[PDB]
């Protein structure tokens, strides 16, 4: 609540806190000896995302300023951003694998294999294009952890007088993460013009990640009604928050 630790730390301390809070890369139950259909490919992906959500929730507790918010606000922010955060993490892990998505260290998927699921083709191509963009920009891990934390705080802040100070506190942390991004680019030798341009390029990608998330949320609602891919109870509660 009072005396926010996030508002009284330098940029290099912001990077250290976010880097130390990174969740681990989880493995999949994928068996390469046995190929199977899209219903089982999605079964592996939904099982993986369910376990990833547990680490994401405890990762959000370690994001500066997130504990300062109320429980109702923490629930809202995660309910709206969880798929964006899974997607930017997936895109980050796939940077150094052109044309493929690294869902897990043992699950590196081609776009031809993702076409087994009806509708996953377009979402695969967008995630690939996002990964190709991060590779073009040479995205650094210090910038990725800043962007991922921006997604958590920003994606649900728009959806009484005391609540205005809560949204103002969220924008305070957002502005300080912006300072961290500019601090990082100044250290990399970029001019003031190059810092502002790269900052815009990074935040514009967040618009595409929201787009991928919205489209991805529509497909998850279709799998639930098709009732062919097993969906865990947490994923169903997160999916109900968007529909």
């Amino acid at each position: 609540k009072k005396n926010s630790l996030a508002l009284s730390l330098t940029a290099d301390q912001m990077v250290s806190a976010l880097l130390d809070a990174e969740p681990p890369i989880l493995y999949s139950e994928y068996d390469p000896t046995r190929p199977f259909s899209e219903a089982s490919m999605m079964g592996l992906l939904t099982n993986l995302a369910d376990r990833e959500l547990v680490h994401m929730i405890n990762w959000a507790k370690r994001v500066p300023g997130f504990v300062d918010l109320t429980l109702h606000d923490q629930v809202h922010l995660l309910e709206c951003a969880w798929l964006e955060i899974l997607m930017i993490g997936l895109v980050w892990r796939s940077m150094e694998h052109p044309g493929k998505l690294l869902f897990a260290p043992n699950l590196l998927l081609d776009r031809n294999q993702g076409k087994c699921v009806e509708g996953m083709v377009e979402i695969f191509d967008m995630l690939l294009a996002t990964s190709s963009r991060f590779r073009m920009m040479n995205l650094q891990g210090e910038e990725f952890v800043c962007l991922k934390s921006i997604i958590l705080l920003n994606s649900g802040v728009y959806t009484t007088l005391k609540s205005l100070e809560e949204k103002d506190h969220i924008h305070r942390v957002l502005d300080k993460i912006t300072d961290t991004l500019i601090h990082l680019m100044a250290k990399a030798g970029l001019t003031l013009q190059q810092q502002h341009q790269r900052l815009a390029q990074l935040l514009l990608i967040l618009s595409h990640i929201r787009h991928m998330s919205n489209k991805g949320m529509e497909h998850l609602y279709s799998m639930k009604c098709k009732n062919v891919v097993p969906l865990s109870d947490l994923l169903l509660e997160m999916l109900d928050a968007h529909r």
Binding site: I57, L71, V75, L78
Partner: peptide, 10 residues
């Protein structure tokens, strides 16, 4: 909510 509880679990 499971998310409500997981955020509460400490």
């Amino acid at each position: 909510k499971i998310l409500h509880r997981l955020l509460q679990d400490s």
